[PDB]
Amino acid sequence: GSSGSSGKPFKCSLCEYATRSKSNLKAHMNRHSTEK
Numbered sequence: 001g002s003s004g005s006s007g008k009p010f011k012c013s014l015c016e017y018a019t020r021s022k023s024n025l026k027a028h029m030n031r032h033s034t035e036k
């Protein structure tokens with residue numbers, strides 16, 4: 001078979017976060033980047 005649409009286009013590579021805009025995901029991925 002093949003992968004589904006997962007309800008939203010931009011699903012985070014680390015967590016269950018997802019959004020309808022790539023710039024909004026990019027802002028969420030910056031939180032994962034700065035957290036240490």
Ligand SMILES: [Zn+2]
Pocket residue numbers: 012013014015016017028029032
């Ligand atoms: Zn995330």
